[model samples]
Target: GEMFNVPELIGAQAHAVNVILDAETAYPNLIFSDDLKSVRLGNKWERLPDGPQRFDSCIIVLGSPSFLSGRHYWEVEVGDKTAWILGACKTSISRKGNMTLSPENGYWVVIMMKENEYQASSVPPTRLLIKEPPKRVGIFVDYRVGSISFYNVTARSHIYTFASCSFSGPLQPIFSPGTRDGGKNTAPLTICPVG
Candidate 1:
C-alpha cells in the first residue's frame, strides 16, 4: 500500500533504483530473507561466514549494488519498527569494528529513536520533527550534486537532507533496524518495490 513518485518530489530525473540488503555485508547477528529485501535482528547469531565486511558491534547492512554517480531513489517499508536507521555510506567505510556514523566517517544517515523522536546522525545528532512516525521512508540521492535526502513517504514531506557531501568512492545504502530489545522491535526493515 506504500507508494510515491520520486521524480515529483525532488524535481530531478529519477531512476528506478531497487536496493537489497547485501547478506555478505550484513552483521552476523542480523537475519536477511531469501530475496535479501527484508532484514531484522535475529535472537541468535547464525553461523555466517567470517569476513572483514561484516559489522561486529552495530547491527548494520549495506546495499548489494553500489552507486557512483546518478540520480537514484528507493523506498523502505519500516512497518511498525520503533527504532531504526536508514541512509547511505561510502563503500570503504569501516565494517569490522565499532564506527561512529557521521559525515566525517563517510556515513550520512537519519535514525528513528522512538515513536515520536527522529534524528540526523551528525556529530551533535540534529533533532527532527515529525507529527507521526512514517510507515514508509523514501531515499533520494543525487550523487553528482552531493546530496542525499530522506522523506516521510506516507506523509509526502521531507525529513532530512545531507548536503555538500563529498563522494570519493561508490556509496551503498546502509541500514540498522536497531538492537533487539527482548523482541520489542522485531519488525523487519523491508525494501519495497518501486512504484
Candidate 2:
C-alpha cells in the first residue's frame, strides 16, 4: 500500500480553522503575543488568577476554535526551537499537576526533544524520525474516525498519528513551547494561516 504523504493527508484546506492561542488556558510562565497567534516560555511567572482551565505547572496553552464532529486542520511554525509539543487535547483533561500525555488521558500530541529527537505521545512514548527537521508542522484531526495526525510540513514527511482516539467532549488545539533553556530555546511557536 502507498503511504500517505503530507499533501494527500491534508485532503482539503476548508478544514483549516482559525486557531488563536487562548490566554486563559495558558500557564503562568507561558507568554503569548498580543494577537494570540504566538506563544513562548518566559523566565518569570506571571500573576494570574487560578482557574479550572488554566495549567498550573505545565507550560502549555490551549488554542481557540473547537469542534467535535468532523475533519479539521491547522499548522504551527516551530521555527528553530529545540523542544516543543504539538497536538490537540480534550477540553476536560486535567490542566495542572503531573500527568502523562497520552490518548488514555485525552492528549494527542508529538514532542520534540533536545538534540532533534521527535517522539509520539502514545501509550508508551514512541520515538519517530524526520528526514529533515521540521520548521513548520501540520496538524490534522478526523473526529469521525477518531484520529489526530502530525506532519512535518517543512520536510513534507509524516511524523505520527494517534488513531482510535475516544474524544469524549469538545477538543481544542494544544501546545507547549517547552521551557526556554537559558535563552537557547527561546523561539516562539506561531500559528500559521492555512496557505
Candidate 3:
C-alpha cells in the first residue's frame, strides 16, 4: 500500500462509497433536525470547553421527525479528513426550521468521499499473492489511526471507521442511489444536484 497526502478541495475525479449506519444500534435521544433537504453540521468543541483546539471534528445530520417516515436523499462533496454521520434518528427539524430547516422532515446520514485526483490501486496489490484455505483465516488489512470515525451525534460515542485508504486527493465523490433504513423519514436541508 502507498501513503497519500491530503488533496486540495477542487472539482475532480474520485470515488465515493454508499454508507448506512446499522439500525440495530438504538440511538434514542435524537438531537439533529435536518431532513436531508440540506446538510446540517454540529461542531462539538463547545461541549468540551476545555481547550485550545486545532482541527474541528463535526456532526453531519440528515432528516427530521414531523416530515414523514421513509426514504430521503442527500449529496455532498467530501474532504479528505472527515467522518460524516450520513444518517441518524431524529426528533425534530430544529424549532428554527424555516430557512436552514425547510420542509421540516426526517433524519438520515449520507457522507460523500473526497473526489480522487489519483488512485493507489483499484484494489491494493499487497495481498494479491495471498491464498485462502479452509479452516484457516486470511485477513488483508490497511490501518490508519484516525482516518474517519462516525459518532452517534447525541451520545457522542464513536460509531465506525469509514475509509482507511491512504490516498492523495480530495477524492471527488457522490452517494449512489439513496440510503434506506426502517427508522423515520426526513430530508436534508439542501438537496444538491448529484454529481
- The lDDT values for all models are 0.82, 0.83, 0.24
Candidate 1's TM-score reads: 0.91
Q: Arrange candidates by TM-score, descending.
A: 2, 1, 3
Looking at model 3, residue 39 earns an lDDT score of: 32
Model 1 over residues 17-80: C-alpha lDDT tens digits? 7788898888887888999899998866454777877888888889968988888888899988
The per-residue C-alpha lDDT of model 2 at residue 36 equals 91
Identify the runs in model 3 with alpha carbons over 4 angstroms from their true place: 1-146, 172-184, 189-195
**Quick one: best TM-score, which candidate?**
2
Give all TM-scores, in the order shown: 0.91, 0.91, 0.22
After best superposition, candidate 1 residue 17: deviation in angstroms? Answer: 0.6
Model 3 vs. true fold: TM:
0.22
Please give the distance, in angstroms, between residue 58's alpha carbon in candidate 3 and its true position after superposition.
24
Model 1 CA deviation exceeding 4 Å by range:
1-13
Question: Tell me, what's the RMSD of every candidate?
Answer: 4.3, 2.3, 19.3
Question: Any runs in candidate 2 off by more than 4 Å, and if so which?
Answer: 1-14
